[PDB]
Amino acid sequence: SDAITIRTRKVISNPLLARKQFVVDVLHPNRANVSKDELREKLAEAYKAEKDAVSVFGFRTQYGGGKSTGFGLVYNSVADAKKFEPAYRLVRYGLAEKVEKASRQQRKQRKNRGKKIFGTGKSIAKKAARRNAD
Amino acid sequence: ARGPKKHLKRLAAPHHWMLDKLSGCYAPRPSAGPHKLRESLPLIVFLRNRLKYALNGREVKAILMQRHVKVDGKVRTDTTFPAGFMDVITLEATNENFRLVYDVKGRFAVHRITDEEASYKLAKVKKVQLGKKGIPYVVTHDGRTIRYPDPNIKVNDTVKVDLATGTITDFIKFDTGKLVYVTGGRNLGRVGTIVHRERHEGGFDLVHIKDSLENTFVTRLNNVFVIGEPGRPWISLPKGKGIKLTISEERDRRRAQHGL
Amino acid sequence: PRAPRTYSKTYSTPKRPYESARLDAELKLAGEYGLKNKREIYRISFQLSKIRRAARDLLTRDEKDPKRLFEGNALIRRLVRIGVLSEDKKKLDYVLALKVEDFLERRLQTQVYKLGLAKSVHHARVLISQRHIAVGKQIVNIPSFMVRLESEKHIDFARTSPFGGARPGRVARKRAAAAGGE
Amino acid sequence: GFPMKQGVLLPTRVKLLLAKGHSCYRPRRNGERKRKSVRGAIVGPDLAVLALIITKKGEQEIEGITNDTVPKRLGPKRANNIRKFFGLTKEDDVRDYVIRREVTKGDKSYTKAPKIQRLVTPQRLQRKRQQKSLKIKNAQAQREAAAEYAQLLAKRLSERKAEKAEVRKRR
RNA sequence: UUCAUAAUAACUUUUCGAAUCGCAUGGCCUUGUGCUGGCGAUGGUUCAUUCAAAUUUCUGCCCUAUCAACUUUCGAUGGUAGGAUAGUGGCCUACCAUGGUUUCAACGGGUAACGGGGAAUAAGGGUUCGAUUCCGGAGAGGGAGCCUGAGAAACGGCUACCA
RNA sequence: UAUCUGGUUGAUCCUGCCAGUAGUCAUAUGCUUGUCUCAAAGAUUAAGCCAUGCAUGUCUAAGUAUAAGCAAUUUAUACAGUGAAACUGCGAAUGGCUCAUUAAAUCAGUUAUCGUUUAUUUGAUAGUUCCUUUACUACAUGGAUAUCUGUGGUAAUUCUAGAG
Ligand SMILES: [Mg+2]
Ligand SMILES: [Mg+2]
Ligand SMILES: [Mg+2]
Ligand SMILES: [Mg+2]
Ligand SMILES: [Mg+2]
Ligand SMILES: [Mg+2]
Ligand SMILES: [Mg+2]
Ligand SMILES: [Mg+2]
Ligand SMILES: [Mg+2]
Ligand SMILES: [Mg+2]
Ligand SMILES: [Mg+2]
Ligand SMILES: [Mg+2]
Ligand SMILES: [Mg+2]
Ligand SMILES: [Mg+2]
Ligand SMILES: [Mg+2]
Ligand SMILES: [Mg+2]
Ligand SMILES: [Mg+2]
Ligand SMILES: [Mg+2]
Ligand SMILES: [Mg+2]
Ligand SMILES: [Mg+2]
Ligand SMILES: [Mg+2]
Ligand SMILES: [Mg+2]
C-alpha cells in the first residue's frame, strides 16, 4: 500500500534552458520522505526521459506527513543537464565529482603570499639559497 | 558619496518592480541605459520574477549570454540591461515576443505581442534640435537620436520607429481629443482620451484626460504618452485597457467571475 | 543591512492588576474552556479590541461612504466566514457586541467538544496536543486554530494515529509484544 | 644596501621623493609618489658594490667574461625588426627567416617560433578594405539622406507658398 | 536669450578623423594571389541619453536674555574689472561705496544632537526617543597637502607635523 | 487603550504632592528555564588603543606568448592547443563600519542649472590627414621597456642596482 503518488503542477516547457520545469507533489501514505533519486527515476520514466536528464530538489514535507512538495526539472538531454545545472546538484546526482578545494582561508593566505612577491618564484629560490649561504 | 554609486539596496528599489523585500539584501540595479533606473525594468527581474523562466540569477545570466533575448531587435546581452518602457523583447526560443506596458495598477505587466507588429515601436519625442552642420535630429524617450525627421514634428509627440533600421515610420501630433497613455505617478498606466491641455506658463504643463468611462483626471505633461487617435490605439493595449476600475468593482468582478 | 522582518504583540495586559470581579470572570472562562494561561483571554480580548476600534472608526463616517462600504463588508465577510457572528446580524454594527466568549466559541477544542470526540473539553485540548485530530486530512496540534465555519464539517481524526484507524502506538504495541513474548 | 641614483651629485645618502619614470622605485599603485632613501652619485669608500661596465678590451684576458659569450637571448619579433636584424631585402618574405626554437621535451621533438606582429597578412588588407568600403558607403548614404531631406523641404515650402497665395487672392 | 545652428576673418607651441583583434572566410573571374563582400570585438570626434556630480529657490530645526547688539583694520554688505573654478558667485585680488542682520530673538553659550523616513505612548489634543536594518551628510588617530583617475582632498593611496 | 487607590486631621471636606498602577523594537541585573518560528546585539563610558588572520582583484574566440611550463595527441613551419608570470586596460571613489565635529549647518518637501562636469550604457555622427597631389612605406613607420636569463647589494620591507 506504499504507492508513491507523484504528480506535477505548474509545469512550463522552457526551451531557453532546454528544460521543462514544474513543482512536484508526492502522496506517500504511512511512509517518510521519499528519497529524491527515486523521484528522479519515477519522473524520468514518466516523461520518457533518462534518469540523468532530470533534476529535482527542494523537498519539504507538510506538517503531518502524507504529502510533500519539491521542485523538479526535466532536461531535454543529459548534456543539457551537464551544461545547464549548477555542479553541486551534479555531485548530488553523482554525474560529476565534487571538485576538491583547499579550505578558503588556505586559498586566501596563499593569495596574500603570492601578492607578497613581484613576479615568479624562480628568481628568489637560488638568490635566497645564496643569501643564506652567504 | 565620492563618485558614482553602483550598489542598490533591496528596499530602495521601486515598488512596481514587485521585488521580494525578503529572500535577499540587495536589488538588481539597472546599468546605464535608455531609461531612468526609477522607471526601467532590468531583464533579471523581467525573467526571474515576472515570467518565472529561470530560478536563479546564474541561469538568467546564462539565458542572456546565449543571445536569445532581443530588445528592439538587438541582443542586449547585459544581465541588468535596463529595458525600459514598451521596448520589445523577442525570444526565438518559443518564437514569442512581448511589449513592456504598465498595467492598470501601474507595474510592468507582461503583454503578449504577436510577431508582425512586434517589429515596430512607438516613441515620445523629448526634444527637437538642430545638430551640427545644420542637421536636424529628433530624440525620444528611448534616447534614440533619429536623424532627419519630418520637419513638422515637434515636442511631446509620438513617432513610429521601424526598429529594423531605426527610422521613423509615422507620427501622431499632440493635441486635444486623442487616445493617450499615462506613464507616471498616481494615474500610472491609465489610458485616456485627452480633453484639455492647460499651461500655467513657465512650468509643469498639465493635461485633463478622460478615460473610456467618462472619469476625468488631471496629470503633469512629462508623464503623458500619446497612443493613437480616439478609438484606434496604434498599439494593442494590455488586457483591462487601463480603465482604472475602483476597488469595489475589483471585488465585485472577482465575485462575479468566480471559478476555482 | 538586512531588511527588517517585522513582528508584533498579540495581547494587552489589563490596566487594573488585581480587581476581583475581572479575576473571577477570567478564571471562569478558563474553567469552561480549559484555557492554559490567562494570556489566552487577553489575546482574544486583544483581537476583539481591534475589531471594536475598527468598527467605531467606520461607524464614525456617514453610511454609504466608499471606504465605509468596502471595509465594513470585507470585515463582516471575514467575520461570517470565521463563523463568530451570525448570518442574520450582517450589519457592521452588531459587531460592536461580541462578548469575548463568542470568539472563544470558535476555538478548535471548543468546536471539537461541541461536535463530541472530547468528553471534558480538557480531553480535547490534550487530544489536540497529541496530534490526533485533522481538519480535512490535515492534523493540527494548535488548540485554538480559530476554526472557520466552512471547514468545520470536516474536523475529524487523522488517517495516521489511533482513534482514526491506524497503528495502535507505543504502549498497546509494547504490551502486546510483552504478552506474546511473556 | 641602499641603491644609488644617477644625478644626485653627492657623496652621501639622501631622502628623496620619487615616482614613475625614475629608477630606485617601482609604483605598485598607479601614480603614487613615495618618499624613499637613495644613495648619492659621488663614490667614496662607503659603497659595498660597484656595477662597472667594461668599455674597451684589455691586454690581459679575464677568464669568465671575454673568451666565452652568453648567447643572445631572444630574437627580433616585429617583422620590420626582423628584416633590419637580418638585412633582408624588404620584399623577401621574412616569414621563413624567423629563428625557430625546436624544443625537445625529452621524447617528442616539437616546434616553437614567435608570432610575428605587424606582418602583412591578407587578413590585414581584408580589414583595410572593409574599413574603407564601409566609410565610403556611410558617407554616400548620408549624402543621399541629405538630398532627400532637401527635396522634402522644397516640396513643403512650395505647398506653403501655394497656401499663402490662395489666402492672399481669396481676401 | 548673445540658445541651437550657420557664415566671414584670422589663431593654434594643431586636438581628432582606426598602422587595432576573433570567427567565417562568400562572389567575380580582370585565373591573380588579383579585385572584392559578412557576422562580430575593441577603440574614436561631437551631440544626445543614462548613471550621476556639484552648486540652488522657498519653508521648516532643541534649550538658554545670570547672551542684545553683532559683522567690517584680516571680506563684513554691494559695485566695477580681473584672476581662479568645469561653471554663477567676495570664491579670491585691485579700486571704490557703507552697507548686512537683530526683541518676528540676530550674535553668543549648551546639547550625554548626525538630520530625516520613523519608534514608544494614546478618547481627542499631545509627550518622549530616533546610535542602528531605508535615504541623505560627515570621518577613517587629529589636523593640513597632494598624484593618479570621469569621479577622492581617498585613507585596506601617498606627503609632512602632532599624539 | 476616555477608570483611578493609600498618606496630613480626633473627624470632614480641599490645594497639593509623594506613593501605588500600566506599558516601553529602553537597557542593566537577579532568580528561573522544556519545545516551534523569528531575531536585536561593544551605540551610551573611549571617534580609546590594537597583536594576529582575512576583508579588491580581475582575460574573453577577440590587446600583448618562445614560461628553456604543461600540452602532444590527432587539426598545427610564422604562431595558432592549454596556460604561469609580466605589460596593457578596467575597478579599486561601490560595498561595510561609526555618529566625533555639525543648530538654517546637515536633512525633508518643493525648485533651478537659459550657469556647469559627466568614464561608462544606449542612440546617432567624420570622404578633405593631400598642402602644389610629375621623387612617397601604406601590401603596414621607429625606438624603448617589462616578464625572463644572468651578477648582485641590505638584517630585515610587496626594497630593487647593473648587463642581455
Ligand atoms: Mg558609501
Ligand atoms: Mg553659440
Ligand atoms: Mg565678474
Ligand atoms: Mg535628534
Ligand atoms: Mg537616529
Ligand atoms: Mg546609511
Ligand atoms: Mg571620506
Ligand atoms: Mg581607533
Ligand atoms: Mg576609470
Ligand atoms: Mg583625508
Ligand atoms: Mg576606504
Ligand atoms: Mg599607498
Ligand atoms: Mg495641616
Ligand atoms: Mg491618624
Ligand atoms: Mg509615581
Ligand atoms: Mg520535538
Ligand atoms: Mg565607540
Ligand atoms: Mg586558450
Ligand atoms: Mg593591469
Ligand atoms: Mg553621539
Ligand atoms: Mg555628538
Ligand atoms: Mg549656536
UniProtKB/TrEMBL annotation, chain A:
The annotated region (Disordered) lies at 101-134
Pfam families xrefs: Ribosomal_S24e
Gene Ontology terms, MF aspect: structural constituent of ribosome
- Coiled-coil ranges per the record? none
Which keywords are on file for this protein? Ribonucleoprotein, Ribosomal protein
One GO BP annotation is: translation
Gene Ontology cellular component list: ribonucleoprotein complex; ribosome
| Basic residues bias spans | 104-116, 124-134
User: What's the family?
Assistant: Belongs to the eukaryotic ribosomal protein eS24 family.
State the protein's name. Answer: 40S ribosomal protein S24
Automatic annotation (TrEMBL), chain B:
Listed A to Z, the keywords are:
Ribonucleoprotein, Ribosomal protein, RNA-binding, rRNA-binding
The record's SUPFAM superfamilies line, in alphabetical order, gives: Alpha-L RNA-binding motif
MF terms per GO, please? Answer: rRNA binding; structural constituent of ribosome
RNA-binding S4 domain segment(s)? 41-105
Q: Show the GO cellular component annotation of the record.
A: cytosolic small ribosomal subunit
Q: Name one GO biological process term.
A: cytoplasmic translation
> What PANTHER family is this protein classified in?
30S/40S RIBOSOMAL PROTEIN S4, SMALL RIBOSOMAL SUBUNIT PROTEIN ES4
> Belongs to which family?
Belongs to the eukaryotic ribosomal protein eS4 family.
Oligomer status and interactors: Component of the small ribosomal subunit (SSU). Mature yeast ribosomes consist of a small (40S) and a large (60S) subunit. The 40S small subunit contains 1 molecule of ribosomal RNA (18S rRNA) and 33 different proteins (encoded by 57 genes). The large 60S subunit contains 3 rRNA molecules (25S, 5.8S and 5S rRNA) and 46 different proteins (encoded by 81 genes).
UniProt protein name? 40S ribosomal protein S4
UniProtKB/TrEMBL annotation, chain C:
In which family does this protein belong, per the annotation? Belongs to the universal ribosomal protein uS4 family.
Listed under subunit, the entry gives: Component of the small ribosomal subunit (SSU). Mature yeast ribosomes consist of a small (40S) and a large (60S) subunit. The 40S small subunit contains 1 molecule of ribosomal RNA (18S rRNA) and 33 different proteins (encoded by 57 genes). The large 60S subunit contains 3 rRNA molecules (25S, 5.8S and 5S rRNA) and 46 different proteins (encoded by 81 genes). Interacts with snoRNA U3. uS11 interacts with MPP10. Component of the ribosomal small subunit (SSU) processome composed of at least 40 protein subunits and snoRNA U3.
User: What is the role of the protein in this entry?
Assistant: Component of the ribosome, a large ribonucleoprotein complex responsible for the synthesis of proteins in the cell. The small ribosomal subunit (SSU) binds messenger RNAs (mRNAs) and translates the encoded message by selecting cognate aminoacyl-transfer RNA (tRNA) molecules. The large subunit (LSU) contains the ribosomal catalytic site termed the peptidyl transferase center (PTC), which catalyzes the formation of peptide bonds, thereby polymerizing the amino acids delivered by tRNAs into a polypeptide chain.
Q: Which SUPFAM superfamilies match?
A: Alpha-L RNA-binding motif
Classification lineage: Eukaryota, Fungi, Dikarya, Ascomycota, Saccharomycotina
Signal peptide from the UniProt entry: none
Protein name as catalogued:
RP21
Q: Which GO terms describe its molecular function?
A: rRNA binding; structural constituent of ribosome
Reading the lineage from the top rank, the first entry is: Eukaryota
> From which source organism is this entry?
Kluyveromyces lactis (strain ATCC 8585 / CBS 2359 / DSM 70799 / NBRC 1267 / NRRL Y-1140 / WM37)
Region called Disordered, residue ranges: 164-182
Please report the stretch or stretches of sequence annotated as the RNA-binding S4 domain: 106-170
For this UniProt record, the keywords arranged alphabetically read as follows:
Ribonucleoprotein, Ribosomal protein, RNA-binding, rRNA-binding
Write down the InterPro entries for this protein, in alphabetical order: Ribosomal_uS4, Ribosomal_uS4_CS, Ribosomal_uS4_euk/arc, Ribosomal_uS4_N, S4_RNA-bd, S4_RNA-bd_sf
